[PDB]
Each structure stands twice: as C-alpha cells, then as structure tokens.
A paper describes a structure:
For this purpose, we exchanged GT in positions −5 and −4 of the wild type coding strand target (I-CreI_D75N_target, Fig. 1b upper sequence) by TG, generating the non-cleavable target I-CreI_D75N_target-null. We observed that the structures of the variants in complex with the cleavable targets showed the presence of the 3 reported catalytic ions, while the structures in complex with the non-cleavable targets indicated the presence of just 2 catalytic ions, with the central metal position occupied by a water molecule. The absence of the central metal ion in the non-cleaved structures, would explain the different catalytic behaviour. Our results clearly point out that in the cases of I-CreI_D75N_target-null and I-CreI_3115_target-null sequences bound to the I-CreI_D75N and I-CreI_3115 proteins, A at position +1 largely deviates with respect to the usual B-DNA conformation. In particular, we found that in ~ 30% (I-CreI_D75N_target-null) and ~ 60% (I-CreI_3115_target-null) of the simulation time A +1 is not paired and is found stacked to the corresponding nucleobases.
I-CreI is a homodimeric member of LHEs family, which recognizes and cleaves a 22 bp pseudo-palindromic target (5′- CAAAACGTCGTGAGACAGTTTG -3′). This region contains two catalytic aspartic acids (D20, one per each monomer).
Numbering used by the authors:
A (entry chain B): 202 to 354
B (entry chain A): 2 to 155
Write the structure that this text describes.
Amino acid sequence: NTKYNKEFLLYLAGFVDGDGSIIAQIKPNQSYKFKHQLSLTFQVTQKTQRRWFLDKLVDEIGVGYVRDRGSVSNYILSEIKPLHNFLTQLQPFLKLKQKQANLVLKIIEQLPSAKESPDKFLEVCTWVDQIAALNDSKTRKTTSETVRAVLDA
Amino acid sequence: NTKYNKEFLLYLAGFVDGDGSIIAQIKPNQSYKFKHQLSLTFQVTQKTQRRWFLDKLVDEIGVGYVRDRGSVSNYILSEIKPLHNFLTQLQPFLKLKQKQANLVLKIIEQLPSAKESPDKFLEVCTWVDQIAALNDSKTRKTTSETVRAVLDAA
DNA sequence: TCAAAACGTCGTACGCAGTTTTGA
DNA sequence: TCAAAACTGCGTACGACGTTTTGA
Ligand SMILES: [Mg+2]
Ligand SMILES: [Mg+2]
Ligand SMILES: [Mg+2]
Ligand SMILES: [Mg+2]
C-alpha cells in the first residue's frame, strides 16, 4: 500500500477526466454463483504512438499494465485492492469522473457482503447502473434488471 | 498579467493533454500583406452536455469564450496577449503538448518582426509546420511552403 | 468459483484543421 | 490590414462497453 505525490495526482486527474475511463460491468458468466461477474476497470487510452506516456503510468502508479490493440493502447488497472488504494487518492481531484470514482470505491467495499445475498448483490448492481449513467454509455447490454431477470430461477 | 494557482495549472495541463488542442495556422487571406494570416488557437473540446466545465474555464482563466456547435462545445482562447500569459504558466506542466506550447509562445514573440520580412515570415511559418507535426494532423492544406510558392509570384 | 487477464465491438467526442467575415 | 471572431468539414483517438479464457 503506497502513497502518491499530490502534484502527480492533480495532473493525472485532469488527464483521466480527459481520456480516462472508470468502468463497471456485469458480465454474463455461468461459472459464478449468481451467474454474473462484477467487473471493475480503470483505464487510460491513447494512440499507440504515445505508448511511452502509458508506460510511465505503470511505473508511477506501480501497478497495472499496458495492452496494445492495433492503433490504440490502454493502461489498465483491474485488481480490486490496488484499484481501491489508487482511486481513493485520485478521487478528490477528479471533476468529471468523481462520482464514478466514489461509486466504484463503494462497490469494492461491499464486495464480500455481495457474495452472500441475492438482493445485496442486486443492490451493488444498481450502483453499476449509476456508473454507466454518468459515463457516455452507448453499447451497454447487461443491466441490473437483466440480473434479477436471471435470478428468477 | 494575471498569475494562476499552481494546483489549477496542474489539473488543467492534464486535462489539456487529454482533450485540449494547441493549434497554429496559416490562413489564405488576401487582405493580408503576405496573403496569409498567422492564427494561433488554444482550444478545449467537450460534449455540450458538460458545457459547465468549459464555462468554468472562462471564469478561471478570466478570458476566452465558449461556442456551442451542436453536440460538442469548445472553450476558445485566441487573443495573442492573454494566450502568451496563459501558455507561459501552463507549459511547465504539460507532458504531451509542451513542445506545441513553447512553439506557439515564440511565434507570438517574433510576430511583430515577421510583419517586417517575407523571409522572417517564412521562418515563423516553419514553426507552424512543426506544431502541426507534433499534433495528430489529418486535414492540413496551407503549409509554410504554400506561402513560399505564393510569395514567389511577385 | 473467483479474480483477473485476454480478446473484440462499436459510436462517437473529440482534436485539428479549413474557409470566411467582422470592425475599426 | 489586422486581430479576432464566426462558421464548417472531417477522420480519428478515444471512451465504454461485450464476450470469452486463464489458473488455482
Ligand atoms: Mg474526453
Ligand atoms: Mg450518460
Ligand atoms: Mg486525447
Ligand atoms: Mg504527428
């Protein structure tokens, strides 16, 4: 568990509000108790030509990794506990994605508890709905309603 | 000249490297002594639904305006003199657009002496070439060489 | 199972210009 | 003539998902 330079957090919050993405998903996966994975992702996108910038993120955040996909690359942070540490420090400086940040911090904390009750899990699922509401969501499919519509069994 | 708070500059540089644009142009306009205007623009683009963000920049930078062209909006800063003050304090915190900014800054300084000479005017136009090379330029037409092949017809 | 990684899809929301006009 | 504003075109570089696989 590490602490970040505030001047680095400020700059990064601006960049994240620009080209970053704080993403929460419900993934239809039969292998899970409630037939769905709760997925949290922090991501920063950039033209692969500027992959060096993303490399620096990995170095400076100390965790996460870069993935290439043709012309575009992504810094990706998915691991729940480093995500929590990082987002908790970033969140106060975000202006466009602060709500998304806080909802994710929230979702994370309620995660053991959500693996117990079919309707605690659905509650966390609605928090995910809120995150996508705040984002410029366009191709979403699996909402919280498609989750209770499955628990109908 | 207004001096900006460092925390504001830091966040903003990050946002500018994300969704901003530092733009230099050679505009074919025959009302100009060399048949072209040197145009410098600092721009921040955003979905109009989030206009408030851009409108706050107007408050915080204390100059510039916002225009809405349908689904997106822009904060625009063109006035050469506040542009210089602003980009001077912002530039140390930029990481992707630092070069563009420093280039725009010295285009501004040499702008009077470029009124003087067609040669000094072409040198300056070279700097505009460099700004566009550093950007993700895709639809450029008028270059420093377009200017040369027009100053020759004389 | 589950956290996490891997791999693909899709519609913009940006960026980066162009052209033309204003108003002394 | 000029600084500056106004208006327009266009091709991504992003954003924000989906679907499937890993590896104990
Ligand atoms: Mg953006
Ligand atoms: Mg929305
Ligand atoms: Mg960008
Ligand atoms: Mg380039």
